[PDB]
Design an enzyme around this catalytic site. Structure first.
Site, PDB file in Angstrom:
ATOM      1  N   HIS A  83      16.068  26.771  30.290  1.00  0.00           N
ATOM      2  CA  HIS A  83      16.812  26.858  31.578  1.00  0.00           C
ATOM      3  C   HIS A  83      17.214  28.248  32.006  1.00  0.00           C
ATOM      4  O   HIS A  83      16.940  29.198  31.074  1.00  0.00           O
ATOM      5  CB  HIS A  83      17.804  25.899  31.886  1.00  0.00           C
ATOM      6  CG  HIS A  83      19.111  26.069  30.952  1.00  0.00           C
ATOM      7  ND1 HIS A  83      19.041  25.296  29.944  1.00  0.00           N
ATOM      8  CD2 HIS A  83      20.384  26.382  31.568  1.00  0.00           C
ATOM      9  CE1 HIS A  83      20.408  25.646  29.330  1.00  0.00           C
ATOM     10  NE2 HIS A  83      21.095  26.232  30.178  1.00  0.00           N
ATOM     11  N   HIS A  85      20.159  29.729  32.241  1.00  0.00           N
ATOM     12  CA  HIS A  85      21.111  30.529  31.973  1.00  0.00           C
ATOM     13  C   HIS A  85      21.161  31.370  30.733  1.00  0.00           C
ATOM     14  O   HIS A  85      20.117  31.812  30.115  1.00  0.00           O
ATOM     15  CB  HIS A  85      22.319  29.317  31.165  1.00  0.00           C
ATOM     16  CG  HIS A  85      22.831  28.633  32.432  1.00  0.00           C
ATOM     17  ND1 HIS A  85      23.464  27.458  32.194  1.00  0.00           N
ATOM     18  CD2 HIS A  85      23.216  28.814  33.835  1.00  0.00           C
ATOM     19  CE1 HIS A  85      24.028  26.887  33.330  1.00  0.00           C
ATOM     20  NE2 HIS A  85      23.504  27.892  34.135  1.00  0.00           N
ATOM     21  N   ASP A  87      22.249  31.875  27.676  1.00  0.00           N
ATOM     22  CA  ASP A  87      21.937  31.598  26.276  1.00  0.00           C
ATOM     23  C   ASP A  87      20.456  31.136  26.057  1.00  0.00           C
ATOM     24  O   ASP A  87      20.131  30.788  25.144  1.00  0.00           O
ATOM     25  CB  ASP A  87      22.895  30.330  25.919  1.00  0.00           C
ATOM     26  CG  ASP A  87      22.767  29.237  26.367  1.00  0.00           C
ATOM     27  OD1 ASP A  87      22.484  29.466  27.901  1.00  0.00           O
ATOM     28  OD2 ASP A  87      23.069  27.899  26.232  1.00  0.00           O
ATOM     29  N   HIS A 148      22.169  19.100  32.644  1.00  0.00           N
ATOM     30  CA  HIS A 148      23.054  20.279  32.629  1.00  0.00           C
ATOM     31  C   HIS A 148      22.438  21.423  33.725  1.00  0.00           C
ATOM     32  O   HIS A 148      23.501  22.006  34.075  1.00  0.00           O
ATOM     33  CB  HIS A 148      22.754  21.075  31.158  1.00  0.00           C
ATOM     34  CG  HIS A 148      23.290  22.238  30.888  1.00  0.00           C
ATOM     35  ND1 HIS A 148      24.507  22.445  30.610  1.00  0.00           N
ATOM     36  CD2 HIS A 148      22.711  23.569  30.841  1.00  0.00           C
ATOM     37  CE1 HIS A 148      24.834  23.571  30.225  1.00  0.00           C
ATOM     38  NE2 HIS A 148      23.610  24.295  30.750  1.00  0.00           N
ATOM     39  N   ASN A 179      30.178  23.314  29.854  1.00  0.00           N
ATOM     40  CA  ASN A 179      30.026  24.006  31.229  1.00  0.00           C
ATOM     41  C   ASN A 179      29.244  23.109  32.054  1.00  0.00           C
ATOM     42  O   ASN A 179      27.922  23.243  32.017  1.00  0.00           O
ATOM     43  CB  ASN A 179      29.454  25.353  31.103  1.00  0.00           C
ATOM     44  CG  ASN A 179      29.334  26.173  32.468  1.00  0.00           C
ATOM     45  OD1 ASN A 179      30.128  25.786  33.304  1.00  0.00           O
ATOM     46  ND2 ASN A 179      28.150  27.017  32.455  1.00  0.00           N
TER      47      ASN A 179
END
Ligand SMILES: [Zn+2]
Ligand SMILES: [Zn+2]
Ligand SMILES: [Zn+2]
Length: 230
Positions: A83, A85, A87, A148, A179
Site C-alpha cells: 500500500h 504508506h 513503511d 487498513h 494508525n
C-alpha cells in the site's frame, strides 16, 4: 526465534526463513516516543528474488539489500509495495537506483503521489475490484477490499502456503487499533472475510508488524477492528 525490536539496532535489518524459499524481513523505525518493528517478505523466484515491501525508509532499505546480498546472494529483480504508506514505499528510490523494478497497483501509485511519497515505477493491472487476484511470479496478489487502507494488497505464496497480510492484518499482541487515519473501518471486516474465503489453506500468516501466526490472526484483527469501531 522470531526477531523482536530488542534484537534489531535502528538502521539494521534481520531476515527470517519462514519456509523453503520464503523469508520475512524485519526492520525498525522510531515513531513519536516508541520504536516499532515492521515486516516485509522475500520470495525466491527461480534464481532471482521477489521483494514484498521496503524496509521503511532509504537507509533501512539499503541495509535490507546488503543483508539480502550477504545472506541469500541472489539478485532482487522486482519489488511490490502493498500500500502507499512509507513503511511500504519508503525506500523505493533506493531500490530503483539499485536496478530493482518497483511495482504497485494504480490505486497505490495514485495515493502515494497525493501523499507526496515515493512512487513505484510499474503498475500492477487487474487489482482494482475487491476479490481481484493476479499472479506475479511465485506469488498471487489479492485485493481484498479496503481495510487498513483503500489500496491494501495481500500476498500469497502457494508453494509454501504463506499468507502475507501486510498492515491489513494485526499481530495477536496488538489488542487496540493502530494508525487508522486512512482506513475504511466499515469495510475492513468484510475485506478480512474475503481473505479467509480465498486462502483457507494458509499455514503461516504474516502481519505487517510483529509476530507471525496462523489464520486466527484474521479473526483477531476483525475483533480488534470491531472493538475500535464501537
Ligand atoms: Zn500503513
Ligand atoms: Zn522497469
Ligand atoms: Zn503498517
Amino acid at each position: 526465534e522470531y526477531p523482536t525490536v530488542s534484537e534489531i539496532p535502528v538502521g539494521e535489518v534481520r531476515l527470517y526463513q519462514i519456509a523453503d524459499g520464503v523469508w520475512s524481513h524485519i526492520a525498525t523505525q522510531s515513531f513519536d516516543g516508541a520504536v516499532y518493528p515492521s515486516n516485509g517478505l522475500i520470495v525466491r523466484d527461480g534464481d532471482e528474488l521477489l521483494l514484498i515491501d521496503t524496509a521503511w525508509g532509504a537507509k533501512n532499505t539499503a541495509a535490507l539489500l546488503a543483508e539480502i546480498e550477504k545472506q541469500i546472494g541472489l539478485p532482487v529483480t522486482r519489488a511490490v509495495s502493498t500500500h502507499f504508506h512509507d513503511d511500504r514505499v519508503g525506500g523505493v528510490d533506493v531500490l530503483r537506483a539499485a536496478g530493482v523494478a518497483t511495482y504497485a497497483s494504480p490505486s497505490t501509485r495514485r495515493l502515494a503521489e497525493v501523499e507526496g511519497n515515493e512512487i513505484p515505477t510499474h503498475s500492477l493491472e487487474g487489482l482494482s475490484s475487491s476479490g481481484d487476484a493476479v499472479r506475479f511470479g511465485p506469488v498471487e496478489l489479492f485485493y481484498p477490499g479496503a481495510a487498513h487502507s483503500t489500496d491494501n494488497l495481500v500476498v500469497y505464496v502457494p508453494s509454501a502456503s504463506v499468507l502475507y497480510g501486510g498492515c491489513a492484518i494485526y499481530e495477536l499482541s496488538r489488542t487496540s487499533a493502530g494508525n487508522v487515519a486512512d482506513a475504511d473501518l466499515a469495510e475492513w471486516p468484510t475485506s478480512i472475510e474475503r481473505i479467509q474465503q480465498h486462502y483457507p489453506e494458509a499455514q503461516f500468516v504474516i502481519p505487517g508488524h510483529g509476530l507471525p501466526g496462523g489464520l486466527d490472526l484474521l479473526k483477531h484483527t476483525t475483533n480488534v477492528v470491531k472493538a475500535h469501531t464501537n
